[PDB]
Amino acid sequence: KSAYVQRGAIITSDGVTLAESVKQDDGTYVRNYPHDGMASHTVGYISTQYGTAGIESSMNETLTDWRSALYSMAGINTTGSSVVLTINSQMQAVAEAALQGYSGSIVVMDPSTGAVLAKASSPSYTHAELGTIIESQLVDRTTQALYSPGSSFKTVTLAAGIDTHKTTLDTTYSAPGTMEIGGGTIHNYANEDMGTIPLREAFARSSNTALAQLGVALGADNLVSYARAFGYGTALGQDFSTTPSLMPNPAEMTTWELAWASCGLPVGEHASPAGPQTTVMQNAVIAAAIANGGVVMNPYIVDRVLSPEGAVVSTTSPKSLGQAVSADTAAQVREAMLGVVESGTGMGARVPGVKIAGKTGTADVGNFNSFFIGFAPYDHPTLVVSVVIEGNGENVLGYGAQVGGRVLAQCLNIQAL
Numbered sequence: 001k002s003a004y005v006q007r008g009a010i011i012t013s014d015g016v017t018l019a020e021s022v023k024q025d026d027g028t029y030v031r032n033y034p035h036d037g038m039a040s041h042t043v044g045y046i047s048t049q050y051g052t053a054g055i056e057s058s059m060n061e062t063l064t065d066w067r068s069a070l071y072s073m074a075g076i077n078t079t080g081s082s083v084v085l086t087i088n089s090q091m092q093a094v095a096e097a098a099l100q101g102y103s104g105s106i107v108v109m110d111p112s113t114g115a116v117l118a119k120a121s122s123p124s125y126t127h128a129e130l131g132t133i134i135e136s137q138l139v140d141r142t143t144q145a146l147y148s149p150g151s152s153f154k155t156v157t158l159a160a161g162i163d164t165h166k167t168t169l170d171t172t173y174s175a176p177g178t179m180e181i182g183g184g185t186i187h188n189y190a191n192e193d194m195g196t197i198p199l200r201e202a203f204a205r206s207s208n209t210a211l212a213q214l215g216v217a218l219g220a221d222n223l224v225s226y227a228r229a230f231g232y233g234t235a236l237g238q239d240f241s242t243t244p245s246l247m248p249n250p251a252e253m254t255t256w257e258l259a260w261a262s263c264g265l266p267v268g269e270h271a272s273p274a275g276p277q278t279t280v281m282q283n284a285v286i287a288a289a290i291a292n293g294g295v296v297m298n299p300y301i302v303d304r305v306l307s308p309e310g311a312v313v314s315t316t317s318p319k320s321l322g323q324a325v326s327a328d329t330a331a332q333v334r335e336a337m338l339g340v341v342e343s344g345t346g347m348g349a350r351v352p353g354v355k356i357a358g359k360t361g362t363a364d365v366g367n368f369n370s371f372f373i374g375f376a377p378y379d380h381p382t383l384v385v386s387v388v389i390e391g392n393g394e395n396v397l398g399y400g401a402q403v404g405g406r407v408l409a410q411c412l413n414i415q416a417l
């Protein structure tokens with residue numbers, strides 16, 4: 001009976017329709033996807049073969065007595081209501097252009113609300129291609145793929161160390177090329193001996209040996225608690241599905257495992273999952289919480305629902321998942337992240353004439369992935385970005401940062417119009 005009931009439209013915040021139902025002469029309705037290929041994973045689909053995904057799935061209730069027995073009356077009475085997303089089409093096009101030629105994903109988010117302004121996964125597909133045989137492409141690498149976050153997770157270790165008042169940005173750390181911890185070995189990248197340096201510098205240069213010592217000083221309970229307070233263990237998304245980011249049961253962790261976890265590498269062996277394992281969306285949520293004075297927002301992608309004749313049925317409200325760190329801690333972490341871009345591993349994210357802050361990472365998976373989270377402008381951030389570029393075959397060292405800065409710069413100009 002449901003082919004005869006018109007399905008509501010899915011529309012961007014700037015007024016671009018990405019999904020629509022069209023009436024047949026038959027009486028039935030056919031699902032049409034204008035600008036087919038934009039925000040495909042987010043818009044989603046309902047397919048017998050390929051399953052259901054995205055807004056088509058999560059808002060299916062919304063987009064979907066005596067008259068019900070008459071199929072001829074299904075068309076007149078009740079139309080589906082439409083969904084206006086928080087996605088902006090120009091920011092979406094920006095994120096999609098930056099992923100051309102690469103596998104991975106980008107999220108652009110408003111740090112004060114958690115509104116998702118761009119959400120792109122690559123490789124992507126068109127709805128036309130769902131009517132044919134295809135495999136990778138269908139995985140939503142923003143929300144439904146887990147990755148070792150590598151050094152980008154040091155944002156959480158740093159935040160926890162500062163928030164528990166166990167260290168400060170100017171506290172010095174030995175940052176040798178190799179160190180014995182928990183009866184195993186931790187190395188800096190390239191075995192680089194950095195000598196004794198302040199934590200802000202250990203963070204800007206992404207020393208594993210330094211940040212591992214902080215993780216060990218923190219202990220497993222604190223490291224796991226802080227990860228969870230940033231959202232680990234929560235299925236992020238008010239109105240979309242994200243697979244929870246994972247940490248171990250702290251009681252099961254060893255010291256060596258702890259050392260590695262605090263650098264973003266999951267090496268545990270126990271009943272509970274190894275961690276951290278992250279989504280890109282979770283990485284955005286962390287950057288956003290840091291950008292927003294420590295207040296974690298549950299991200300969302302629907303702005304509002306519109307009745308068939310264009311009335312506002314309802315509006316999403318921003319909702320907090322709590323205060324993960326104090327405002328004072330957040331300002332310190334923001335400062336440390338500025339250092340990453342101004343003088344450490346994130347210089348590829350620099351954009352002349354605007355202050356960009358962030359944290360980079362690289363995780364071995366002979367393949368490695370490149371991560372970046374960041375926000376801008378440094379003073380009064382209005383945007384957050386989270387990026388993964390998957391190596392696969394290629395060396396992609398530093399690519400996440402170059403992509404991140406580019407996306408932020410172009411999204412700021414869009415914001416400005």
Ligand SMILES: *C(=O)[C@@H](NC(=O)c1c(-c2ccccc2Cl)noc1C)[C@@H]1N[C@@H](C(=O)O)C(C)(C)S1
Nearest residue numbers: 150151187188189190206345360361362363364
């Ligand atoms: C965290 O991402 C860090 N990554 C590494 O150190 C990592 C290594 C490596 C080499 C020897 C012993 C242990 C490990 Cl994990 N191999 O692959 C990567 C490079 C640092 N962060 C990165 C950046 O912020 O992206 C680096 C490249 C500066 S190293």
